[PDB]
Amino acid sequence: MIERRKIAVIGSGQIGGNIAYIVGKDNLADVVLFDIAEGIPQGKALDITHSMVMFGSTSKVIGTNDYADISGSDVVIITASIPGRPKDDRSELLFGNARILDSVAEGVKKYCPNAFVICITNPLDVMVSHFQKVSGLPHNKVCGMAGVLDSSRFRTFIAQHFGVNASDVSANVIGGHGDGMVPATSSVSVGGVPLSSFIKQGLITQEQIDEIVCHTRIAWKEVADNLKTGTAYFAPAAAAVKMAEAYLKDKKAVVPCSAFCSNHYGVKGIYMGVPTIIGKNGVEDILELDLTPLEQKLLGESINEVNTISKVLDNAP
Amino acid sequence: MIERRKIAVIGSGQIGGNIAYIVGKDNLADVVLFDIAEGIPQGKALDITHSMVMFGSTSKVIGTNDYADISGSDVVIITASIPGRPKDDRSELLFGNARILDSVAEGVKKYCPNAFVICITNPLDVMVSHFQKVSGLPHNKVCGMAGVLDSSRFRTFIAQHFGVNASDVSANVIGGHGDGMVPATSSVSVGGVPLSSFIKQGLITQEQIDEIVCHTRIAWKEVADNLKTGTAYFAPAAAAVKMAEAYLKDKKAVVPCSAFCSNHYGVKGIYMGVPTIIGKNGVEDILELDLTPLEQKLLGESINEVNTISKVLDNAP
Amino acid sequence: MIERRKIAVIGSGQIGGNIAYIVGKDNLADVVLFDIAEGIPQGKALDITHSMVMFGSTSKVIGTNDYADISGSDVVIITASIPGRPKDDRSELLFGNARILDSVAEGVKKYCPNAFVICITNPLDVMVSHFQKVSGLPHNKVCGMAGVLDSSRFRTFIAQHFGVNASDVSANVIGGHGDGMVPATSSVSVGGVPLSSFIKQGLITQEQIDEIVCHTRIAWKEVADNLKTGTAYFAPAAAAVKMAEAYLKDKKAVVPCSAFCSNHYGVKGIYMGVPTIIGKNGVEDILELDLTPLEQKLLGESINEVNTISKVLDNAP
Amino acid sequence: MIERRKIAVIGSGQIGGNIAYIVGKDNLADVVLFDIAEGIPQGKALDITHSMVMFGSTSKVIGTNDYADISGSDVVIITASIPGRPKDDRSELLFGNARILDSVAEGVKKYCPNAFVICITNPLDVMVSHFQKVSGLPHNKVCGMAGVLDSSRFRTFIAQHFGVNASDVSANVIGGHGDGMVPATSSVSVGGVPLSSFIKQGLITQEQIDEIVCHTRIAWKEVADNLKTGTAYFAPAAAAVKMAEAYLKDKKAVVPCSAFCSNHYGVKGIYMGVPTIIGKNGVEDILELDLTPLEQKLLGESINEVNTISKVLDNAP
Numbered sequence A, B, C, D: 001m002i003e004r005r006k007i008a009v010i011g012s013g014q015i016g017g018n019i020a021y022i023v024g025k026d027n028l029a030d031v032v033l034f035d036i037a038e039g040i041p042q043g044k045a046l047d048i049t050h051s052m053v054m055f056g057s058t059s060k061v062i063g064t065n066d067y068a069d070i071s072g073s074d075v076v077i078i079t080a081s082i083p084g085r086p087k088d089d090r091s092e093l094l095f096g097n098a099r100i101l102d103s104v105a106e107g108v109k110k111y112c113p114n115a116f117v118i119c120i121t122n123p124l125d126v127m128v129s130h131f132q133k134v135s136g137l138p139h140n141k142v143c144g145m146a147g148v149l150d151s152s153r154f155r156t157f158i159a160q161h162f163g164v165n166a167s168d169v170s171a172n173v174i175g176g177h178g179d180g181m182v183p184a185t186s187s188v189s190v191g192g193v194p195l196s197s198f199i200k201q202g203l204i205t206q207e208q209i210d211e212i213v214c215h216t217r218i219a220w221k222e223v224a225d226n227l228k229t230g231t232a233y234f235a236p237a238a239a240a241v242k243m244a245e246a247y248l249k250d251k252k253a254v255v256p257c258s259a260f261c262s263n264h265y266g267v268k269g270i271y272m273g274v275p276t277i278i279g280k281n282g283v284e285d286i287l288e289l290d291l292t293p294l295e296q297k298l299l300g301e302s303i304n305e306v307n308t309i310s311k312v313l314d315n316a317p
């Protein structure tokens, strides 16, 4: 007896609504939009439902305030957050969002403990770790969306320099989703050609590469300062869907995401951005990039950044 | 020498952003997001740009406040509007949006007069008529999105009663996009079966049909009352994209939309909801539904409402 | 634990290979190409496998001669047939293909008795009935591909007359997949407009409608006589995939197909072409079209045709 | 005034039919299937036409034997060939196909000289060179499909070893489409990780890499030996469509193909497999891979094989 695939979206704000829209459009799964705010998920679900016939999709999209309705969810995507964008740092949301995730963890533990959980709520890496701890779900079934967004920005900026299809740029961002994130320039390639070759050919300079690295790191503020009323939500939504696809279709896709890293990158059990393989069993493996000594040091500094914010949370009021 | 297809989105609010998102996802065309509001179109364009690699699309999406950037646009979709939802009737936005569309009309007339123009700005039918007059574009190259949304809702509600795929329901809403809209029950079919047969078979009652017709007419309020911030925007965006697809791909698709009807439905030159054929020459034809006497009367009342609101706009200092 | 969807294609000839190609392209499921001929399914599977990366699909496609490899198949599509096209009638393959289906039934019964079975092997309606009888699978889990092909041809020919998108033509063919098939002109509509209206408007004649009906009935020979080496295989393959999609995605799609009809169309338990609803439980309902007295008589003659060939099979040597 | 995109397929055999099928399914363009064989292109075009409504596509697909019907074609894909698979080497088809391409060249030169031409006919690299000379079309508007197929096989085999999505493997095959083809192991990456790292990590041996390289070179025989009727045709068709997409959508995609290389890889005007950038102006650029001394030597041997076979064609009565 085949059953419809089911994705629960916890938090039906800017990102949550976009996820439902795209999931429905692709007919990837049925969607349950959950929110504590009255009307919001219901209104978005009805609106998106009307669009399904236009897209030729038979996906069902419903809005709810009841955790019983996320029962049997294959994937749970957590977007729930306290209101207002971060001013200077994503960690400003730490204390409030940790408390939200405590409640979300109780819902998931009760109604869909076998779900693959994708966290989006900031500060991403610490929130993922917090959710895994309080929910008690297996490490391989809990991860955070970040690397796909960061790497997509990184790839896009490289692609825009060379004037080529971004899909043909290979580029990874690793470490914590913050100022310390590490766009690994050493393993960048465009159609198989490394950046070192493009430098020799005079088609890109190291300063231009440095600018692209900086642009990747500050990209969230560039979008946020232009939108004014909030942070990015079109690309983060799409990134989460790509991760959900990898799980639901058992793709064995290489997905940069915040995952529990135990025998790689010199760490012994920490949630941080790494290249994973995602399939039907969740996070099934982690790949080891060839990092330069400089990149290894920058990754070390990112790890310190993650541990620092994590310790602040451990000593929360 | 083939050129990239180009869609201009005038107004980068709730609907405009979704249009850019979906157009980019489908790689239907490049997108220019235009708005007078500072930052907004630029922020959304950058955000959506980051998602393009995630979707495997090479569409370019840019934000601007300069009408020179919509030059060479194949399609122009107008969402520009004064802020705030209508309380009781869509015609509350009449005067403000009429003035807005004057500026849009001069922009299109100057920089892309050969564009196919799809209006979304409310009050839809009168705004479409208004834009055509001030812009001077051919009647067949200017239309309004409404019928696709209304008909999609109608199809969805019928489908939900019978428990079937809405794509296999054929159903049209005609007349003005307002309370007087006419969900034509006489031409409803589900996989070839008409409603009259379903009544005889005992699978639906006339009362249930009446409820579906009413639901269709008031559907906009059901969404808006729940969103508690504005009107529907996921489905309206998708509908506009389907209309743009019909044009850009020369589909000869049957598209219910607000079009200039001059020799059908007992009218002699009025913009109202009718079943059109859309291809590379814009609105290429209008189909004549086999309406009952009751439906002809209801359509007459719709035409009166359109004329009434249109005359109020014509009579101003 | 989510598992990959799995389709078994029994017979890896012209149709079988196309099914695997399209299923793989859409990433609808993994495919097992089964055939008794050495090398054929293996070669096609390897070739199609190479294309998967080009389509961005992670579907696995393998070739085999072992029924153990169809274990756990969600859908089984039967294309197996004795060599050579029919000269004048599809029933020429009756005796040989009945024997093939005996063997296929033993494989399915042993390794995937819960599979949804879609028969393509001709003569279609009698082969479907034969397979259900010998396999012992539930009536609702065994059906034949025919109506989607016949109706698609019917819709296409109508669409080509009016110069419109065929997707906007509603048209059904019912009865046995043979000379007696009944293209139901009475329930044809183009964007909601019935043929009777187009006749009054002077846009189509009854003779032109009769030609389209005739063309639909003889379409198989038109393709076959041009191909020379066999019968149609691109459209029949696509039709089967649409049916597989409806089941796997639980679409509740209206699908004309050869199904067990017990309380509709004046029959009390016969496999013939009817409009069905297909979902996760297979054939879940049958819709009753509004047939004219003439159409009811033609359907009666089709039923006689089906019973005649069925009785020939019952008295096979 | 936008026009429908148009692809001409010259030769409606195994590959040509699949190209038409997929192009139509994707609604990438209208298709003209050309062949000298009576009935074949007409039969396939009619068959594929019936499937268009099933796929929700409005692409027109027609069959012909008249070069006047390829007038205004944006892309021309040449599959025309003498019958029968090669026994040991692709160059066995040299003289017969050279004469065939003479007639195709005069057709294209007369009716669509501004078309982007993608050759598939073997022996690929020499046939591409031959067509360019006799047709007189710009070097950048004529290329051959090979690299996409060879690289796709290479990527697939690498992906199968590591158990990952082949889409996340970056890998190039360069040089002539023959035994001398060079799967460039030095620029292989899996999610950013190079093969040298995988060796150090103990996840692959040099012997396994050598096997993959060999498998890639002989892959055509593995398929052909199993098909027992001709050569591969599902993947070659898909590859040609991906190249047509890059052109028609102006993707600026990195496409390994047989292109006119005049200032890269130590050659001064030869058609061979190289990583190109394809957009609306055809072959717009060629990327320079960072090849090892061994790979440079292997590429030199490939260039010799191409020159050898090319000289045999030049020397004829």
Ligand SMILES: CC(=O)c1ccc[n+]([C@@H]2O[C@H](COP(=O)([O-])OP(=O)(O)OC[C@H]3O[C@@H](n4cnc5c(N)ncnc54)[C@H](O)[C@@H]3O)[C@@H](O)[C@H]2O)c1
Binding pocket: A010, A011, A012, A013, A014, A015, A016, A034, A035, A036, A037, A040, A079, A080, A081, A082, A083, A084, A093, A097, A100, A103, A120, A121, A122, A124, A145, A146, A149, A177, A230, A231, A232, A233, A236
């Ligand atoms: C990691 C990354 O790249 C990235 C990118 C963009 C946004 N984000 C984060 O994603 C989160 C959501 O962003 P957004 O969608 O724009 O925010 P927003 O539009 O404010 O939506 C948040 C939603 O959460 C709802 N909510 C609040 N409390 C609860 C609760 N206890 N249970 C369920 N729902 C609740 C709330 O009603 C609102 O609809 C924020 O924390 C962002 O910082 C992360």
Ligand SMILES: CC(=O)c1ccc[n+]([C@@H]2O[C@H](COP(=O)([O-])OP(=O)(O)OC[C@H]3O[C@@H](n4cnc5c(N)ncnc54)[C@H](O)[C@@H]3O)[C@@H](O)[C@H]2O)c1
Binding pocket: B010, B011, B012, B013, B014, B015, B016, B034, B035, B036, B037, B040, B079, B080, B081, B082, B083, B084, B093, B097, B100, B103, B104, B120, B121, B122, B124, B145, B146, B149, B177, B230, B231, B232, B233, B236
């Ligand atoms: C016909 C139909 O079915 C339907 C459905 C939903 C919404 N609508 C209408 O569509 C319109 C837009 O809806 P929305 O996107 O939710 O509204 P909203 O999110 O407010 O977006 C409107 C945008 O227009 C911009 N704008 C204002 N003045 C100008 C100007 N002179 N030039 C260019 N841009 C300007 C403004 O900055 C804002 O970003 C409204 O009038 C709605 O009533 C129609």
Ligand SMILES: CC(=O)c1ccc[n+]([C@@H]2O[C@H](COP(=O)([O-])OP(=O)(O)OC[C@H]3O[C@@H](n4cnc5c(N)ncnc54)[C@H](O)[C@@H]3O)[C@@H](O)[C@H]2O)c1
Binding pocket: C010, C011, C012, C013, C014, C015, C016, C034, C035, C036, C037, C040, C079, C080, C081, C082, C083, C084, C093, C097, C100, C103, C120, C121, C122, C124, C145, C146, C149, C177, C230, C231, C232, C233, C236
């Ligand atoms: C209903 C409808 O619309 C329609 C349309 C087109 C074709 N068909 C029928 O579909 C069938 C297949 O057509 P095709 O693919 O062109 O035919 P073809 O290309 O000959 O393929 C038939 C395949 O079946 C294989 N086969 C033979 N015996 C067995 C067996 N015992 N077990 C497993 N495999 C076996 C055989 O090796 C061959 O590869 C024929 O019976 C056609 O008449 C039906």
Ligand SMILES: CC(=O)c1ccc[n+]([C@@H]2O[C@H](COP(=O)([O-])OP(=O)(O)OC[C@H]3O[C@@H](n4cnc5c(N)ncnc54)[C@H](O)[C@@H]3O)[C@@H](O)[C@H]2O)c1
Binding pocket: D010, D011, D012, D013, D014, D015, D016, D034, D035, D036, D037, D040, D079, D080, D081, D082, D083, D084, D093, D097, D100, D103, D104, D120, D121, D122, D124, D145, D146, D149, D177, D230, D231, D232, D233, D236
């Ligand atoms: C480069 C590469 O990777 C690759 C892969 C697979 C096949 N191929 C080649 O592609 C070619 C076609 O393969 P196929 O489709 O399997 O072969 P096949 O199925 O025989 O089709 C060839 C078609 O060309 C037609 N034809 C013959 N002469 C002419 C002419 N003068 N004008 C127009 N059409 C003509 C002929 O009627 C036939 O339908 C062969 O040469 C293969 O070797 C190349």
